[PDB]
């Protein structure tokens, strides 16, 4: 929620989210195979050009 898509995909390339949940749920019941199984894109913004042309270096 707190940051933009470029930084969210940068998190998905490792599994930084999957590590964080595996650390938080140690006290409740220790997990091992914690992955972000899937991501679906539901609604996208108004297609500008400068956004993608700076996402492409």
């Amino acid at each position: 929620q707190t940051n933009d898509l470029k930084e969210v995909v940068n998190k998905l390339i490792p599994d930084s989210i999957g590590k964080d949940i595996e650390k938080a749920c140690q006290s409740i019941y220790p997990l091992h195979d914690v992955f972000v199984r899937k991501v679906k894109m539901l609604k996208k913004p108004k297609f500008e050009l400068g956004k993608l042309m700076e996402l492409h270096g």
């Binding site: 940068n10 390339i13 490792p14 930084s16 590590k19």
Partner: protein, 225 residues
């Protein structure tokens, strides 16, 4: 089984630093150093270990710099310890260069507002002015002392466990000299241990010799120089 092609270890460690998560970035590299991939110093092991000890310094963990160097030297035997020597020298240079920057900033920027601060005593220090002294010491402790108790440990570290007797090592007496030169820049109680460690490891030296230990004798370098 975490890694096929141990070059990938660095790719994930760098990829975790794209997020800014240094703990899981370290976790990867430590998990890689300690497994089947003990093939005598692959050219990849230099940047693996160098990034590993960079992260270990930034997180301020002595025990993990101990472990990394202890795994590296085991796999990096006399076949080539040229890289171990450059690894330990780099690790020590990172530690002492960050402490220089830590003194500089916590002894200027925060001590320059401390020159402007309420030195015209408030009651809060008039209670504390029966045990302690100057506010420069009361602040620099908070931001500089955490790094010098890491430096000292990092000098005891590389001298204590990595270099006992060890025939192959001039770098021992290099670190020793550079840590004696460290003493008269900063705190002084990390020198009583310095002298007594040099002595205790001399008592470890002159008794048995059942390794590739120093033949303390006519051999001018290892004994005299």
């Amino acid at each position: 089984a975490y890694f096929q092609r141990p070059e990938n270890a660095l790719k994930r460690a760098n990829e975790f630093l794209e997020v800014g998560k240094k703990q899981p970035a370290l976790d990867v590299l430590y998990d890689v150093m300690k497994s089947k991939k003990h093939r005598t110093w692959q050219k990849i092991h230099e940047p693996i270990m160098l990034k590993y000890l960079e992260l270990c310094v930034d997180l301020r963990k002595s025990h993990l710099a101990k472990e990394g160097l202890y795994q590296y030297k085991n796999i990096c035997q006399q076949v080539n310890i040229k890289s171990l020597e450059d690894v330990v020298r780099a690790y020590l240079k990172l530690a002492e260069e960050k402490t220089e920057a830590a003194k500089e900033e916590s002894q200027q920027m925060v001590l320059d507002i401390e020159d402007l601060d309420n030195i015209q005593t408030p009651e809060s220090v008039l209670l504390s002015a029966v045990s302690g002294e100057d506010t420069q010491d009361r602040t620099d402790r908070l931001l500089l002392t955490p790094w010098v108790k890491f430096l000292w440990e990092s000098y005891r570290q590389c001298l204590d466990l990595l270099r006992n007797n060890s025939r192959v090592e001039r770098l021992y007496h290099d670190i020793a000299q550079q840590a004696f030169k460290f003493c008269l820049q900063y705190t002084r109680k990390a020198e009583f241990r310095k002298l007594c460690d040099n002595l205790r490891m001399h008592l470890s030296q002159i008794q048995r010799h059942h390794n590739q230990s120093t033949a303390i004798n006519l051999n001018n370098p290892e004994s005299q120089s």
